[PDB]
Amino acid sequence: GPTGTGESKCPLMVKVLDAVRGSPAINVAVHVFRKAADDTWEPFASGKTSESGELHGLTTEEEFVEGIYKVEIDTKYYWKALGISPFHEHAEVVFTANDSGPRRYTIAALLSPYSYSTTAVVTNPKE
Amino acid sequence: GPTGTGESKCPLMVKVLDAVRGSPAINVAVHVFRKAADDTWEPFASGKTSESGELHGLTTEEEFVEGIYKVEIDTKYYWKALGISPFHEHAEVVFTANDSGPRRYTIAALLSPYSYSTTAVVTNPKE
Amino acid sequence: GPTGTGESKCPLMVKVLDAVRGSPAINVAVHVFRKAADDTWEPFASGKTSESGELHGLTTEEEFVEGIYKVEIDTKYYWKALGISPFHEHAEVVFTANDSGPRRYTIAALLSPYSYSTTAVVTNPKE
Amino acid sequence: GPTGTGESKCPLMVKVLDAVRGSPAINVAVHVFRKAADDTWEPFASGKTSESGELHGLTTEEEFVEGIYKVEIDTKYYWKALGISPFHEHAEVVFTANDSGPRRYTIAALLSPYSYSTTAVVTNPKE
């Protein structure tokens, strides 16, 4: 649907859960970078998790080209605002998106102070 | 809404993901038991995961009384149909539901052959 | 020797870690069970996790035969001492032991108030 | 001694486990980095995981000072040897080391084609 920037049929979605409260991790900053030609990391998109703990509308299909991306979840300020001191500075996820035709990626993350898991769920663009 | 048996505003929902394929764990058997008065386990409800890897309509609010329940995910036949031999016979989750007023429980599970994580997300009945 | 029910060779070890504090879980109660004839759970061995979070010397090679064992780790109380109300009554791991050999089974567990991940590390013994 | 860059006291250990095979991950490449002045990543230490999946003797107490270190574990290739196409380029763990002490840091990681969980076990040394 929408082309350029925005939501569209969300080709990239992020979900954060809180393993200490058993609730969605609300208002967590997410920073997406893409591997640019000079090998450095260029800012691709950014956003905060909603009440449901999800971040949609990060990019559109026409913008989400092949490449390597890194999803940075700023987990530390999340715990610090909770008064808890955490171990990691953030949690990043690096991958090759789109090198065999367009896909949908759902990057899910379970959080705890001294531990974290990440899972991706990829699907082939359906109606 | 609906009272007795069925879906309603789903007071108990289950979600299974596949950590080896990066996809929803489809058609996995889920068996829910409740701690009956004689301490044994009585069958409460059952179902299979859908295409989205979720199981809804297990019970209604009026039926989901306080108590201890065990959600059995029959992970082994899941992997065996995939030709993979797994380590656990199944994955169960035991908890005390409703001892402080009604809640909604989303039991999520990430699966792998020799490992598995489970997370619950509980919320207070909203509109 | 010591054999019977003690370290010796250790065919089964239990490791419990605390994901909120970033430390091992000391004094968690663990109760191993074996599946009996009339399909019930007969008490096998038990103990408490040490200050390093590992539980050694539960059974031995001569007594540890092929079958279905159940490792139930008592987490609720663990969290309770910590002044934390957890979601689970406990954590259990149901598996078919031995098969083609006594080998070595390590059961790992990572706990959070609302989550637990488990892993079995079955490796070949030589000493 | 050995100090400098070797076991000795081991302020930082790396543990890599394979959740698909139920075994430790042997020969995974791990590269530790330290955050430098001009906020970049200066190579610190590196090596390969042993047959038990642990990587010992990376740095030592005198050389391991307060700061931001980065443990990047090269998983993609690991899975590749296994004839499995993974989702991640690698796994990294970004953390502030030392603070109030050299202590001991254990970085645990559990891998799957589409997932990885990580945990830091920072415990008090006495030997």
Kindly state the tokens that stand for B113. Answer: 């052959």
Å from D94 to nearest chain B CA?
23
Method: X-ray
Resolution (A): 2.0
CA angle B87, B93, B94 (to 5 degrees): 135
Distance in angstroms (rounded) separating the CA atoms of residues C56 and C15: 9
Chosen CATH of A1-127 out of 2.60.40.180, 3.20.20.70, 2.130.10.30, 3.10.100.10: 2.60.40.180
Length of chain A: 127
How many CB atoms are closer than 10 A to CB C43?
9
Q: Is C83 on the interface with D (CB under 8 A)?
A: no
Nearest C-alpha neighbor of A71 from the set A100, A30, A121, A20: A30
Residues 6 or more apart whose Cβ sits within 8 Å of residue C110:
A115, C17, C19, C116, C117, C118, D117, D119
Q: How far apart are the first and last CA of chain A?
A: 11
- Can you give chain D as a three-state secondary structure string? CCCCCCCCCCCEEEEEEECCCCEECCCCEEEEEEECCCCCEEEEEEEECCCCCEECCCCCCCCCCCEEEEEEEEHHHHHHHCCCCCCECCEEEEEEECCCCCCEEEEEEEEECCEEEEEEEEECCCC
Domain boundaries, chain B: 1-127
Strand pairing category for A12-18 and A104-112: parallel
Distance CA C31, CA B72 (A): 19
Residue pair D35/D64 in contact (Cβ under 8 Å)? The answer is: no
- Asked if B59 contacts B86 with a C-beta cutoff of 8 angstroms, the reply is no
DSSP conformational letter for A65: -
Q: What is the CA radius of gyration of chain B?
A: 15
Question: Do the Cβ atoms of C108 and C116 come closer than 8 Å?
Answer: no
Q: Hey, which bits of A1-127 come out as E strands? A: 12-18, 23-24, 29-35, 41-48, 54-55, 67-73, 88-97, 104-112, 115-123
The C-alpha atoms of residue B125 and residue C115 are separated, in whole angstroms, by: 22
What is the three-class DSSP state of A56? coil
Cβ contact B104:B122 at 8 Å: yes
* Residues recorded for chain C: 127
Among the partner residues C22, C23, C119, nearest to D19 by beta-carbon distance: C119
CB atoms inside a 10 Å sphere around CB D37: 6
Partner-chain contact C24 D121, CB within 8 Å = yes
d(CA C119, nearest CA chain B) in Å = 4
Query: What φ, ψ does residue A88 adopt, rounded to 5°?
Result: -90, 155
- How close is the nearest chain D Cα to the Cα of B113, in Å? 5
Chains near D with 3+ CB pairs less than 8 A apart are A, B, C
Question: Is residue B66 part of an annotated ligand binding site?
Answer: no
